[PDB]
Symmetry: C4
Subunit: 476 residues, 4 copies
């Protein structure tokens, strides 16, 4: 009976501690920000965007991946809508490197314009038979503008020129070379039998230049994760997401230490033995252990620290985030697995503390909530523009009247491009890691130490006794 | 001499702790909210409304009982007024299942309309003799509208039809059946000699449907408690209340660890050996022990935590509520008795903490203070409507000029129906208990543990860094 | 070297602790508020008014004494002015019970009106010779109105009636009897030789009725203390004050643990071996010991807690008041001497904590600062009236430009009569002592215990979550 | 692995502690404020002005030195500009006591007016040959006004009078005597061969009177320090500064516990074996040790406490200042070296705490930021005048767009002359040291102790419950 151990212990939150400076042999610009979450999941920056309908849609998942992070597409939409959202992220870069779009000569140019405008593409590979996939040509914009009547076989108006192709598996470096020698923009990839396997474009090559640290899969396509809950349509949902290309699924739950959740997760794992599973939230060592034991690959920590979260107020449950991460990370290392610090982070400095306490990555909602990419609804008050930001446990989100919320509905100032937000936080992360001499996150877990501060020390830590009219892009 | 133990120890209040999540095998919707306070007192929800003249009158006592709770009628009124207030609660449902109203043929229809409008009833059972109680008929509204001159014997204008009755003790299920077969709304209950014992109505049956979790007595009448102090008119008051139907009395005192209070309580118990006694406030283990030893059944904990309480400021006395509940609950279990956590609760989450620290029920004042049912006086400021809320130790309350107050006078925003307030708090209670895996309050005492948080952790616990224009019905 | 004990320990201030309720056998109205500070100094209430030029002049010293307390006349004025201020307090009640005013027949009625209007009196005892003091008569208002030309011997216009007198030493009870039988208002007291020793009046008898708990000396005259510093004019000042009637002097210093102060105090004691000495401020056990060892009777505790004090901010020195009182009171009991808790008290509850931590009395400045009696200057802002309140270490006070202040200049709202302020605080003191069961201050030191509270607990202790538009006379 | 010692310990900031009063045998006006930082560096007051482009230029370095302190000229300017800034401080008093300005008869009066107006001087010593330096005369204002055409040899218009001189090495006391007997204002110093070595003026003698406690070098010239970073132009910079007269250089770094910084410092020391080196910031015992071991003479402590500093927020790194000073001072004494408490000081009381925790001097930025001398830019808001104050890590400062700041840009109210600010802080320092009985800073380290206070105690420490409309020059 814990009646005699009713008051267990004290917990620390980001504002109770500071990282202590230490000898350092690594400059901020040379710290390694990569983090491997699972065999299949390694990110170039320890940053992940929350699965919230006001933060992560395909645009955000695309922007955070290009920056080297991971986006988790929210499940507050139909399985079909969420899967298509996921496909959009996979189709972004090297979109058709595999599983290309294509039509037959039989089809009508109209159908070609249908998919050229639906998936927004300059050309459509044309194969003899949808089943044979033997490349016979390709229809392009130039072709569509020359064409008068679209109600005709895409054949009559074609490109039966001397097809220039490359073997399956040619990389971007060699394709760029081939595209340059032939003054072309699209390079179809076919096997030794002329069967179409995919297509490489000049843009793909350019995007590699534009976003050098993008987190991508084996095919050079941006990584993406998607969330699902523990309901009757979970499998259906999970299989639709994986089939759309998801590199991992996130079983998002309010209480991950629930028998039911553990039951469903084991069933999900039993069905997807190879896939990467990230699971719901816990804030204790046993909760992390229960989830790992259930087959999860990555455990997300966080009960109540959310900016828009009212769990601690309405249910009276939770644990200060720095302590929760730490207690859970003790198990993550026992199992040689990973953890995501989820919530309560408001400053770049908080990210370094969350990582130093044992996190392998942090999930951010509030910090991205008002960007160009975030799906939130724009509002104007006092002339300034805002972006709605609501907890998934709020009334509006839990919608299709109030029905016992664990979160609130709010809004945050317009922040502009997410790439800028990310750039500001990485600088703080690199500086933080430079101060404690951590060349990589591993050293951070092993060497970084905290000094506890009081409310006054927190005051000293923030700028004080000075009137600020123009704030820093990394401080309020 | 405690001079060497002047600084005894540290105390915790609701905002210093959080309940730690734990493995759970019970969903929120299946947690058991019942709580037995005494052999005679079991509630369907661990909620009780404060004995304050701005919170609990008969309307509130009726609403909280229908929801499964208990209302404590305040004593800031004459003994006669408080007793009638109590009768109103007993007469609400199955109001005349026993001790029915009745008149004789002799009486004048006028007297019948007198009691039909005083107690608001559609019919008046008519007996041959007030002493014989032999049912001879019943006068109804239809009868009153047909009647021209009321200054006449209720006989001349009557209902000497074929009386349809049921034996004493027939339950609502069988009465409903009888009422339906005879297309009637009132079913008189008589003994084998035709003597009237009570009456069952169609509404009674309907109210059982409308409020399925109502806390009721052996007769299916809503439960109710009433408060009394320790003065010379206490006995007179207590006996008037019990005689009106009170299921328990609350000896409400500022300092329950007083020799005088203990003296009076023992005298009250010596006189009412069977009755359920709930007693004044204490905040220590010895105070609870002194009261239990004096014969009390349920001890209420709380010295100074009240929203409108100034005891800690003007007298400088008190103890942080979570510690007080806990220290007292240690004794409650030694004696195998119960405790009510009284005051300082502002959020549904606080209720779960109060219960987890050892409370068997919580008493709420502020949270109900501005509802439809609360007796407070309405005020308008800035266009919005408010409801006065004053401590019973304030000047105005202590009235029939300032006379050394231990509390203040205030007001709170209009909250609408109390049933809605209750519904919001139960949801939070069920979620809280779900997180720690407590299927019932007992498991809550035995298994739930607290983690201590600092001021910063409290900040993290509440929503932050987000502009809220539309709040949740369960958070501010 | 304390370099290894640089961080000595933690200190508590009034807002860190609460008194724990305990069994009680004494009602608030029967608690004993008396406190003996020294053989010569016993007060009826443990309250003393600060020696500040904006708080204690003769009017305040008179009002607090009538209530049973002690007033300390400030030294921010000439020795002559301070002594006369002191005489005014002694002349208030039984003003001429000894050392009466008197003139000879020789004098001119003009001189009689001079002193009748200077000291405001209805009559002037007239003696044959200033040196003989043989009562020959008495001139009264009635006499002055009958008199046309004042430039004449008070003899020509006289009262050589049958003198009614009483022997030296007759008390008020017997004098009242004599005054009543002779229908007179003034009763001269003479020795067996007709020599005038003093005079008793009807008012004196009435004032005993009006203020039953007044703190008075052996002659039934109100008690009074006066402050002096440690300078070259100290002796001159101290002897002028004692000669005016001071029952005690207060050697007020910023740092009482100074070699110089201890030197001067010992010299003051060596010169006044019988007198009651109260000395400067200390906040440690050794400081209290140094002062006691120097010959002081009562030590006042307090370095930095003052509402208008900036010592802790500008010098960075001080110790939380509850800890200081306690550390010093440990020595006070070793020496069997007393302590005054000086400063930082803002609520009546704070008084009980200060007494419970070891204080024998508390000195209040801020709480009396805006009363009728306080010498502060009235100011009007937003229509409301204020009363200036400045620390004696502020610039303005240290005046005859800024010259390195240890305190600030401020103002407080007009509070009305001090008797009302006192009445509100005693009620809280009696309630506080009732809760812990302390029948007298001694039991308070021996039995009362503190429970430590956090910032949150402090929040819980004060009224919260309620809009207050009309405050209590004992809370803000 | 510190993974098991992740939460190292608690840190204290100025607002967590208070100095405890102690027996004292020294009055404030007799405390010794001198502090020796190095063999070559002893200040008359433990105060140094921050190397910030909005706080310390030559004017400030001049004012703080005259007061007995040390000014550190910031490096946010070209090496040439910073060196000239430094020369200005050396030329202030006894400006030409050595290395005097001079011209030949050959030169044109025009060139004489060029340097008389560039360096603002009443006269120009004239020597036969720039290489011989044999004094032949001196041109003065009177001479320039008599002269019509400046395009002529300074010879034609001269002062070949009977030259009055003094031997090299004559002090101000004897020079004053010589200047007085000859009714002259400038006294050339020449060797036994008539070679000019320098010049003493009446003003120099007057400035000794005007600023009696000025911190000066062996030649009676004000002391001055200058900052440099760890870059490729450091040596060039350091040698330019020393050559301009710098008495010490400050290697200012964000993280002084960096391998690179330690490398550069050792190289700087290896090159300047005699010079006084003050180095970057650390907040740990090892960091101080690493720097001392690298050859630094004085270590400055402080990571994150700055008013305009955001290091703790954006990087999440730092340590409460009182703890940092103390941990570092433990090493300073092991090595018998010194420390400068850098940042987080807002009140004079904070200076005493910083010194008591082990500092030998404190560096102040914010407190001087809006003075006459501070280089900040003036701004007007609401009619009042402000002075910009920005962290050297802010965007604007890091300028020649945002580029990952560790500090912010702000402004502070106009404060008037710095001499007044200094005067207010010394008074508080002397009072603070008087309370703990510290006759000098050494006793402060050895005897002073701290008592820890809570948030409430901090409240008690500051003025409270009083409306202040006119603040003290030493408190807000
Ligand atoms: O209504 C809610 N209640 C509790 N947690 C929520 C709610 N909505 C989102 N969250 C979680 O809390 C985190 C808050 O992130 P933040 O806004 O950056 O602090 C998200 O990643 C979600 O896991
Ligand atoms: O004037 C008063 N002083 C102290 N306690 C009071 C006073 N008036 C009511 N109370 C008590 O404090 C509780 C406050 O409940 P709350 O407003 O919900 O926090 C009530 O149940 C009463 O027991
Ligand atoms: O300028 C000042 N500095 C420090 N203490 C002061 C000053 N002026 C008065 N005091 C002291 O502090 C106490 C403050 O009382 P309060 O205003 O009731 O808190 C007075 O009794 C004096 O002993
Ligand atoms: O942008 C910045 N980040 C961190 N420290 C800074 C920055 N600018 C100046 N400082 C340092 O912090 C101190 C702050 O002094 P203060 O304003 O008096 O608290 C200065 O002496 C510098 O060492």
């Amino acid at each position: 009976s814990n009646w005699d151990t009713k008051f267990l212990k004290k917990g620390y939150t980001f504002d109770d501690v500071l990282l202590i400076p230490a000898e350092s042999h690594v400059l901020p610009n040379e710290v390694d920000l990569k983090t491997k979450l699972a065999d299949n999941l390694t990110l170039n920056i320890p940053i992940i965007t929350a699965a919230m309908d006001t933060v992560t849609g395909s645009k955000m998942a695309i922007a955070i991946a290009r920056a080297g992070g991971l986006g988790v597409i929210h499940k507050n939409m139909s399985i079909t809508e969420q899967a298509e959202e996921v496909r959009k992220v996979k189709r972004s870069e090297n979109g058709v490197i595999i599983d290309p779009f294509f039509l037959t000569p039989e089809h009508k140019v109209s159908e070609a314009e249908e998919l050229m405008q639906r998936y927004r593409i300059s050309g459509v590979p044309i194969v003899e038979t949808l089943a044979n996939r033997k490349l016979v040509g390709i229809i392009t914009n130039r072709d569509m503008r020359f064409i008068s009547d679209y109600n005709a076989p895409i054949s009559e108006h074609m490109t039966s020129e001397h097809l220039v192709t490359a073997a399956v598996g040619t990389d971007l470096e060699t394709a760029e070379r081939i595209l340059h020698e032939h003054r072309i923009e699209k390079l179809p990839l076919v096997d030794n039998s002329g069967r179409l396997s995919g297509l490489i474009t000049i843009k793909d090559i350019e995007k590699v230049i534009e976003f050098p640290h993008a987190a991508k899969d084996e095919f050079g396509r941006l990584l993406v994760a998607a969330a699902v809950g523990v309901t009757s349509d979970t499998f259906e949902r999970a299989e639709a997401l994986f089939e759309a290309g998801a590199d991992a699924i996130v079983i998002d739950t309010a209480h991950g230490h629930s028998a039911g959740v553990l039951r469903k997760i084991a069933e999900i794992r039993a069905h997807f033995p190879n896939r990467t599973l990230i699971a719901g939230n816990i804030a204790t060592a046993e909760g992390a252990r229960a989830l790992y034991d259930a087959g999860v690959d990555v455990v997300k920590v966080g009960i109540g620290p959310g900016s828009i979260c009212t769990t601690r107020v309405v249910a009276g449950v939770g644990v200060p985030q720095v302590t929760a991460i730490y207690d859970a990370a003790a198990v993550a290392r026992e199992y040689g697995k990973t953890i995501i610090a989820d919530g309560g982070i408001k400053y770049s400095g908080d990210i370094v503390k969350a990582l130093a306490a044992g996190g392998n990555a942090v999930m951010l909602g509030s910090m991205f909530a008002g960007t160009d990419e975030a799906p939130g609804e724009t509002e104007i008050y006092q002339g300034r523009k805002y972006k709605t930001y609501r907890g998934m446990g709020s009334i509006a989100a839990m919608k299709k009247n109030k029905l016992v919320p664990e979160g609130i509905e709010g809004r945050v100032a317009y922040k502009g491009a997410a790439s800028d937000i990310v750039f500001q936080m990485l600088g703080g992360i690199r500086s933080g890691m430079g101060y404690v001499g951590a060349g990589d996150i591993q050293e951070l877990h092993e060497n970084a130490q905290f000094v506890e501060m009081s409310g006054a020390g927190l005051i000293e830590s923030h700028p004080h006794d000075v009137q600020i009219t123009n704030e820093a892009p990394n401080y309020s």
